[PDB]
Amino acid sequence: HHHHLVHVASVEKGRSYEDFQKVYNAIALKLREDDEYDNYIGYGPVLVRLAWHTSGTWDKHDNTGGSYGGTYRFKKEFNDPSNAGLQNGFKFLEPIHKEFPWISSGDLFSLGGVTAVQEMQGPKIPWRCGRVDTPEDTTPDNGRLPDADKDADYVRTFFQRLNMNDREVVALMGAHALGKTHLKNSGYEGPWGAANNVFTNEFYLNLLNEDWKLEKNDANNEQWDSKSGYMMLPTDYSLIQDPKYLSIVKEYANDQDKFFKDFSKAFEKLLENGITFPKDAPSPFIFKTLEEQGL
Numbered sequence: 001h002h003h004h005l006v007h008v009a010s011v012e013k014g015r016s017y018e019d020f021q022k023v024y025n026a027i028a029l030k031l032r033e034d035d036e037y038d039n040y041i042g043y044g045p046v047l048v049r050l051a052w053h054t055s056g057t058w059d060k061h062d063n064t065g066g067s068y069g070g071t072y073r074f075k076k077e078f079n080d081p082s083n084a085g086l087q088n089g090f091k092f093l094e095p096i097h098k099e100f101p102w103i104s105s106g107d108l109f110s111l112g113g114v115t116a117v118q119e120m121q122g123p124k125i126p127w128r129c130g131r132v133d134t135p136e137d138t139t140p141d142n143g144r145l146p147d148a149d150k151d152a153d154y155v156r157t158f159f160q161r162l163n164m165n166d167r168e169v170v171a172l173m174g175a176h177a178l179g180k181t182h183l184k185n186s187g188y189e190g191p192w193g194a195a196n197n198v199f200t201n202e203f204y205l206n207l208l209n210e211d212w213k214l215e216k217n218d219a220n221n222e223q224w225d226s227k228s229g230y231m232m233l234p235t236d237y238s239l240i241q242d243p244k245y246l247s248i249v250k251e252y253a254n255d256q257d258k259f260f261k262d263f264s265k266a267f268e269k270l271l272e273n274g275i276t277f278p279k280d281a282p283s284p285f286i287f288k289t290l291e292e293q294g295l
Ligand code: HEM
Pocket: 045, 046, 048, 049, 052, 084, 085, 146, 147, 148, 155, 172, 173, 175, 176, 178, 179, 180, 181, 182, 183, 185, 186, 187, 188, 233, 235, 267
């Protein structure tokens, strides 16, 4: 059994590193300017989640979904219950897309995530251009993004569809250092940590070090809560119930640099799943932060 859907990366006509650095800079400047959003968390976390949700529809079996097509712009995916709240990220990106109308939707959504991680002091994420918009009938159906009310076996099985192994899964879930759950979006409420617009290994430290109590929230869903005001989803808590996940959680809690390196690889892989880069395509771009540019 096999399929023949191939998505070849095609560089936006005549564009090079300097063009994409300008898009990065525009995103980063707006992150700095529109910093009141979500009680001064800012838009960084929602842009990371947008990049992940637009990429995380991928199915390795038939190459449907994924970042290439930019299909979140279509109402079926836009209105996926799993994507509730991402509209805020999309709205943030609208004036960026207006200024740089040549960038594909896929490139913009993925670059938004890269920019957010880097501007929030995370590792450098190499990023490749060339995603090409595909039509409305290529939009994947709802239900390909993960449920939160599940255990480690669910998590492991879920992520096999994205060709992610245990280490890649645990690394990727470290992004929950950023932002928070919002009851109206997901039926869960609260942050995973304190410094939730700074990219760190705090998710792993909190998971291991806090005193967690299994509680019911105001939407009648179970979540783990600490006296510090943090929370963990059942899927997150499963990373310390499963012995193979627990070993990796401990590794990243004890070595931020290792987490950063593994996250960077896994996040680039996530954003590139399903894309064929031709042999003569440009090398991955590593963008400078605003702080690096003195901007
Ligand atoms: C089993 C896998 C996962 C589950 C079940 C899950 C679940 C959730 C849920 C329920 C929220 C709250 C949404 C809201 O109420 O606004 C959330 C937020 C978030 N997740 Fe995940 N997540 C998963 C994996 C990931 C991955 C792989 C990434 C990135 C690499 C990620 C990044 C984020 C970010 C950045 C937010 C914050 C959004 C904000 O503050 O606006 N998550 N996640």
